[PDB]
Amino acid sequence: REIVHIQAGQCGNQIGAKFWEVISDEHGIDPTGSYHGDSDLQLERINVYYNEATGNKYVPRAILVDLEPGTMDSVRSGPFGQIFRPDNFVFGQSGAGNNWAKGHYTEGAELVDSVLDVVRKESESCDCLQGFQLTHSLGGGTGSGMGTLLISKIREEYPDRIMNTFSVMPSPKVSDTVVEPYNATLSVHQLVENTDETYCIDNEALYDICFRTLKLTTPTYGDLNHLVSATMSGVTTCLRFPGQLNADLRKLAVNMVPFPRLHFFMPGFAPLTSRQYRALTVPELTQQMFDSKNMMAACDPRHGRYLTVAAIFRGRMSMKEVDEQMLNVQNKNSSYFVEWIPNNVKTAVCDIPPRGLKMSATFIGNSTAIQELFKRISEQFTAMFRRKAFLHWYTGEGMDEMEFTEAESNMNDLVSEYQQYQDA
């Protein structure tokens, strides 16, 4: 049943806000938390992400975290800003300066216990909590450093719940500062250890998609977050709408993760949309959703092998045609699925389509090609670290070079682990 959602830092709160805007519009709930839909399917699984309020208003089970107040004041100002429980706005004043160390060890340590208090109050109001989802970036300081500190604290207090993240990967093409590879490498090690499933969202891929196929010449963070919103709505369909598949992350985790550390998923969406009218056929949805150009992680699926795949079709369509088309990408490209995991592609369907489309598909791949993302981050890390460049920002908050050496060793290990199964 219930999921407790956390969004941390600048990117965490902007994507998290637009996620809650998108899915609240799906579920009919308006900016004041008042329902206004025409179907009861909108409310059957509404408890997974919402608490029912006095007056049977619906309030997101969402906690909003930052070390500065800027972005969260923009959220409270934003379209659905008032939908959020005001007690759930937890913010410091100093910021983290794009500094993992500040997020994880100094500034964030000061704030983290107050975040855990709001977590606890949301958990206690849950009939039966199944776990947590975090939206954050890995390239800054709050979502990266404090976000992973929170993930560590939450596992300590709830070691048997599911921890799930949507983690935005930094890219030099959409880059705020040079220290992103450092922040991301430090964060990735925390994620390997302390989450059950991580959706790897590559700002590189969101950029290329916005540029090469949506034809947006100058993509903003707004354009990037449109894609993220649509993808997040898609992967959480089973958590929010009635179906033969009930809303639980554990079963998804069990069927997607053959080895505990390899839980980094390559997401994808079709049709790729900027904010048209053409009917998309089921064969088209299927060919696109598997297209490397529709992947939100800038890795090439043909460079690795799929361990597991989950696919989620939305709209009115023939599941006979869906079944057929799914069977035919796997029968026509059986090379790219590991033969030692039989029937490793799962297909779900949901009658309700997202806003503005009559038919969509969401792709969720556990591919060994995701190593390309981690190698890329690792090469950027190493190019600075071999000169100890920009380390003083981190040693000044107490960190030692050893902890950097350990973190890159961990990520290179994770890369070797992916490679081992691409050749097995």
Binding site: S152, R155, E156, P159
Partner: protein
């Protein structure tokens, strides 16, 4: 082909036709097994909480 042991009743009939003749662990062992798995779980959890405390 012999038709034998015919039984009739108002519900139906039954018979046999022959074409051709021929040519546990304890309750305590269970509760022990269940407790041994439980302590393997509580150990691994202690190893995690020790790691988190480091």
């Amino acid at each position: 082909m012999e038709v034998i042991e015919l039984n009739k009743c108002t519900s139906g009939q039954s018979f046999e036709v022959i074409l051709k003749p021929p040519s546990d662990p304890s309750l305590e062992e269970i509760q022990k097994k269940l407790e041994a798995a439980e302590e393997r779980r509580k150990y691994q959890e202690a190893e995690l909480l020790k790691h988190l405390a480091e």
